[PDB]
C-alpha cells in the first residue's frame, strides 16, 4: 500500500526531447512517428489494491495497462508492439522494462518537484518527457 501515491492522478504532457529518435530507434515508421509525436496526451494512473493501472487518453491512441509490481504481463504499445512488460519499483522510480523480438527498452517514471518525468532509453538513445498535474 502507498507505494505510489506521489504518482497517482491525472497528468498533461508539457514537454518532450528526442522523441522522434528514441522511436526510430525502437523502429517505428515514419507516419506513426509523425502522428505520435504530435499527440500531447493525459497520463491516468490509479492505484487499487495492489492492481496499478497507466492510462494514456490521446489524439493518437488510447493504452491502459493493469499490472502488479515485479509480475510480467502482455502490452500492446501504442505503436502496436506486442511486448511482455515488467514494472518494478527502484528507489521510488518506476521502472518499466518492455521485451519484444529480442530487443528491450526501458522507461522510467518518476516523481521530480510538481512533474512527473518520463524517461525512455533505448540502446544509445533517450527521450525525456515531462507531464504536469490536469
Ligand atoms: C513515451 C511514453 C512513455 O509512451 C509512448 C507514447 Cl505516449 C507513444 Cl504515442 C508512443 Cl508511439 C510510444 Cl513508442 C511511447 Cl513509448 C509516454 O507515455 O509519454
Same mark, same amino acid.
Given at each position: 500500500?502507498?507505494?505510489? #501515491? =506521489?504518482?497517482?492522478?491525472?497528468?498533461? *504532457?508539457?514537454?518532450?526531447e528526442?522523441?522522434? #529518435?528514441?522511436?526510430?530507434?525502437? &523502429?517505428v515508421?515514419? =507516419? !506513426?512517428?509523425? +502522428?505520435? &509525436?504530435?499527440?500531447?496526451?493525459?497520463?491516468?494512473? /490509479?492505484?487499487?489494491?495492489?492492481?496499478? @493501472?497507466?492510462? /494514456?487518453?490521446?489524439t %493518437?491512441?488510447? !493504452?491502459?495497462?493493469? %499490472? $502488479?509490481? &515485479?509480475?510480467? %504481463?502482455?502490452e +500492446?504499445?501504442?505503436? #502496436?508492439?506486442?511486448?511482455?512488460? !515488467?514494472? @518494478? *519499483?527502484?528507489?521510488g522510480?518506476?521502472?518499466?522494462?518492455?521485451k519484444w #523480438?529480442?530487443? /528491450? @527498452? !526501458? $522507461?522510467?517514471?518518476?516523481?521530480?518537484?510538481?512533474? *512527473?518525468?518520463?524517461?525512455?532509453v533505448?540502446? &544509445?538513445? @533517450?527521450?525525456?518527457?515531462?507531464?504536469?498535474? =490536469?
Open positions: 500500500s502507498h507505494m505510489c #501515491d =506521489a504518482f497517482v492522478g491525472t497528468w498533461k *504532457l508539457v514537454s518532450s528526442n522523441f522522434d #529518435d528514441y522511436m526510430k530507434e525502437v &523502429g515508421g515514419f =507516419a !506513426t512517428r509523425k +502522428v505520435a &509525436g504530435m499527440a500531447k496526451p493525459n497520463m491516468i494512473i /490509479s492505484v487499487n489494491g495492489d492492481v496499478i @493501472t497507466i492510462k /494514456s487518453e490521446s %493518437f491512441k488510447n !493504452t491502459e495497462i493493469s %499490472f $502488479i509490481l &515485479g509480475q510480467e %504481463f502482455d +500492446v504499445t501504442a505503436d #502496436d508492439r506486442k511486448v511482455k512488460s !515488467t514494472i @518494478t *519499483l527502484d528507489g522510480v518506476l521502472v518499466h522494462v518492455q #523480438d529480442g530487443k /528491450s @527498452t !526501458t $522507461i522510467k517514471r518518476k516523481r521530480e518537484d510538481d512533474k *512527473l518525468v518520463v524517461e525512455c533505448m540502446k &544509445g538513445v @533517450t527521450s525525456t518527457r515531462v507531464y504536469e498535474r =490536469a
